[PDB]
Design a protein around this ligand. Structure first.
Ligand code: HEM
Ligand SMILES: O=C(O)c1ccccc1Nc1cccc(C(F)(F)F)c1
Length: 406
């Protein structure tokens, strides 16, 4: 090469170097005027990304932006995503009206009433794993010993997946979400699909509790959902149900320990916890791989033209750092109003599990402050290995220690 390498479509996604700040490239996008920006995906395709808060709400509500993953022009951010692409879709990949007919089969499990009613169960699960970790003595891996098991046990009960098989499906879920190549991603999905097919057949003998048992005994027995779809739907809920909250827990611990005055204020006044959870959601925005869209018609946005067949990624981490919405947006402030953040999306696909996630993180933070207020990282912040921007944000390992008490 013998010419400058500046490009008007930088590589996307980018990797975080700090868990709670944007990648520098993302900061550059945040500062570029306009709602949209060109980028180049891993294979060479260019696509649009959305980089401003209001425009992200508007485009997430635009029916000309389809969630159809199996569309040829759907933006793929890694060779692994094309596992979810050439696979039968759960409702996260459907458009209305099909999307609502499938999502409505699951919503009874996620109502505000039901979630509020799970609080004692979540508290029991959180405190049990906390006990086992603390009794095991420092040091510890917060991911394997706490952040992952807690939401796994909860979502497994919700679904009717037996927690006994946790080692299998927890490992399979890891391999699907984080793979760098396509085939290891396909294999993880097919191990999962295979396990899920057996559970249905098992339900097809003795009716079990949980959402999967319910969908087997009703919608499936009425032909209203296909077996492939039920598997896909159960897989989406299982994986989302435990990988997202696990990442929020580990990244929130890292973040709070870098803001000790806010963490101390939080411990001193537990009425701040719900607002702190909202702020952490806005600030950490762990699900950026959760904004892909493909346009089925030309879309004009503020003087820029999205043409039919162009991919669009609504990047909610950047949108949540829009300073015309959140004053001083790169500062963590558990007292701020984080209302209207996009960590959960917006519109018809807005996160089904959002209030379960909020409940989990409130109980988790309270239990950590109750039972191990001296928790600290057993390594410095820049000895941690963060995941790349091609997957759910977080850490695969979080070595922690505490002052032992008896
Ligand atoms: C803990 C933090 C969580 C975050 C930050 C998060 C983030 C998101 C985002 C951004 C979307 C939108 C995807 C899109 O627009 O294409 C989404 C959708 C979804 N989330 Fe969550 N999620 C979290 C927890 C959960 C939990 C605990 C569940 C439990 C099952 C869950 C289940 C779902 C489902 C099923 C959808 C698809 C909804 C639809 O397409 O109608 N999420 N999530
Ligand atoms: O997007 C799919 O189709 C998907 C399929 C199978 C399993 C998980 C899937 N998605 C997924 C995986 C992790 C976190 C989130 C989300 F952030 F949206 F909640 C979504």
């Amino acid at each position: 090469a013998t010419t400058p390498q500046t490009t008007d479509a930088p590589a996307f996604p980018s990797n975080r170097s700090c868990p709670y700040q944007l990648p520098d490239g993302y900061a550059q996008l945040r500062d570029t005027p306009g709602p949209l920006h060109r980028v180049t995906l891993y294979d060479g395709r260019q696509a649009w990304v959305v980089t401003k808060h209001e425009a992200a709400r508007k485009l997430l509500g635009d029916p000309r932006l389809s969630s159809n993953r199996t569309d040829d022009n759907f933006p793929a951010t890694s060779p692994a995503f094309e596992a979810v692409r050439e696979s039968p879709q759960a409702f996260i990949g459907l458009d209305p009206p099909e999307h609502g007919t499938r999502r409505r089969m699951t919503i009874s499990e996620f109502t505000v009433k039901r979630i509020k009613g799970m609080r004692p169960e979540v508290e029991e699960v959180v405190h049990g794993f906390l006990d086992e970790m603390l009794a095991a003595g420092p040091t510890a891996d917060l991911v394997s010993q706490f952040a992952l098991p807690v939401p796994s046990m909860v979502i497994c009960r919700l679904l009717g997946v037996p927690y006994a098989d946790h080692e299998f499906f927890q490992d399979a879920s890891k391999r699907l979400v984080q793979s760098t190549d396509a085939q290891s991603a396909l294999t993880a999905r097919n191990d999962l699909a295979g396990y899920l097919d057996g559970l249905i057949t098992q339900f097809q003998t003795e009716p079990g509790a949980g959402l999967v048992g319910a969908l087997v005994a009703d919608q499936l027995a009425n032909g209203e959902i296909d077996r492939e779809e039920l598997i896909s739907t159960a897989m989406l809920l299982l994986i989302a149900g435990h990988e997202t909250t696990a990442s929020m827990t580990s990244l929130s611990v890292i973040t709070l320990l870098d803001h000790p005055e806010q963490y101390a204020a939080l411990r001193a006044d537990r009425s701040l916890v719900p607002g702190a959870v909202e702020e952490l959601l806005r600030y950490l925005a762990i699900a950026d791989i959760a904004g892909g869209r493909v346009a089925t018609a030309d879309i004009e946005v503020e003087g820029q033209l999205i043409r039919a067949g162009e991919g669009v990624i609504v990047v909610n981490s950047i949108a949540n750092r829009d300073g015309t919405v959140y004053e001083d947006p790169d500062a963590l402030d558990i007292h701020r109003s984080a209302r209207h953040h996009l960590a959960f999306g917006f519109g018809v696909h807005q996160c089904l599990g959002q209030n379960l996630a909020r409940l989990e993180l409130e109980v988790i933070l309270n239990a950590l402050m109750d039972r191990v207020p001296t928790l600290r990282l057993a390594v410095p912040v820049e000895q941690l290995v963060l995941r790349p921007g091609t997957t759910i944000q977080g850490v695969n390992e979080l070595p922690v220690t505490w002052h032992h008490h008896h």
